[PDB]
Design a protein around this ligand. Structure first.
Ligand code: 0SM
Length: 293
């Protein structure tokens, strides 16, 4: 939808449910109260980005960040095929609806409830249909023909090609390359000139800097003392990292880089003497990946 994002339509799991049913076996109308809440359960409000609980085809894997642009369902009721679309402002809103009803004599009122599981997100009462039929008379069961959703996610980071920036989530600072002990060393900064390229091989992920002052020494790695420097490409697991998120990596992803040799140590911030980007034991700081325009 926005600069650096892509909208993808995808098939979603939608289901009807008898939301409310009142069987008026007696003569004259009887009144009861009923209230519903149309919208997504446990909406963050501070953000519309939803992390996945379960998959959505091949596009969305678990733990992936997406945004629901819309949800579209096609339903067949009483031999009458129609369809309803739910805009983005409707899914992330908690719309509360309340009202009493007077059911006709010797009749069964039915309010069918439609819900959606768009990658974990439980959109309750997407739609409803108030069907009323006499007691005994076979009512129509609404079926789902095609349930789909339009989701926004972030441009795909093509490994070994797309140039990105690796920002600290908490400090909102970019990871830069400075000199430390005559070697390229990682440290936080505000400069948006420090770009990187992510690779992946048998040994894990690699972080190739494009801004090394010592040419050739360009792959981020953890030393034995814990600090982060850049070295020439080798099969050394100290320059290999493990990302918590599943592939593919997209723009705006929030990830944690865990070293492959120092399996319990992860890429983090630590007020050091010369630099502040380290790879320390029992530490798993979050970093934001973002594509350059
Ligand atoms: C003239 C003489 C008159 C006397 C003659 C005798 C006739 C009497 C018989 C009348 C009985 C009618 C049947 C009773 C109505 C049942 C109501 C019902 O089934 N519906 C439920 C539907 O669940 P929810 O809407 O809560 O979904 C909640 C969904 N969540 C998971 C999001 C929370 C609700 C609670 O109400």
């Amino acid at each position: 939808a926005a600069e650096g994002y892509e909208q993808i339509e995808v098939d979603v799991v939608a289901v009807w449910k008898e939301g409310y049913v009142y069987e008026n076996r007696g003569s004259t109308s009887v009144d009861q109260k009923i209230t519903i809440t149309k919208g997504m359960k446990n909406v963050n409000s501070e953000t519309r980005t939803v992390t996945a609980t379960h998959s959505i085809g091949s596009t969305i894997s678990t733990g992936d960040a997406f945004e629901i642009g819309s949800v579209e369902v096609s339903y067949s009721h009483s031999h009458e095929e129609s369809q309803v679309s739910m805009t983005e402002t409707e899914v992330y809103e908690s719309k509360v609806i309340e009202h009493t009803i007077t059911i006709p004599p010797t009749s069964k009122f039915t309010r069918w409830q439609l819900n959606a599981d768009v990658g974990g997100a439980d959109i309750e009462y997407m739609y409803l249909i108030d069907e009323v039929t006499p007691i005994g008379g076979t009512q129509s069961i609404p079926q789902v023909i095609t349930s789909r959703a339009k989701i926004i996610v972030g441009r795909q980071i093509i490994l070994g090609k797309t140039e990105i920036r690796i920002k600290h989530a908490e400090r909102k600072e970019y990871m830069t390359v400075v000199s430390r002990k005559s070697w390229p060393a990682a440290t936080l900064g505000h400069s948006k000139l420090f770009k990187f390229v992510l690779y992946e091989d048998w040994g894990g992920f690699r972080i190739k800097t494009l801004n090394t002052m010592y040419s050739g020494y360009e792959y981020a790695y953890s030393s034995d003392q814990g600090g982060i420097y850049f070295d020439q490409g080798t099969d050394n697991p100290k320059q290999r990292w493990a990302i918590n998120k599943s592939l593919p990596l997209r723009h705006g992803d929030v990830v944690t880089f865990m070293n492959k040799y120092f399996t319990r140590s992860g890429l983090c911030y630590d007020d050091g003497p010369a630099t502040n980007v380290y790879c320390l034991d029992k530490r798993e700081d979050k970093w934001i990946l973002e594509v350059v325009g």
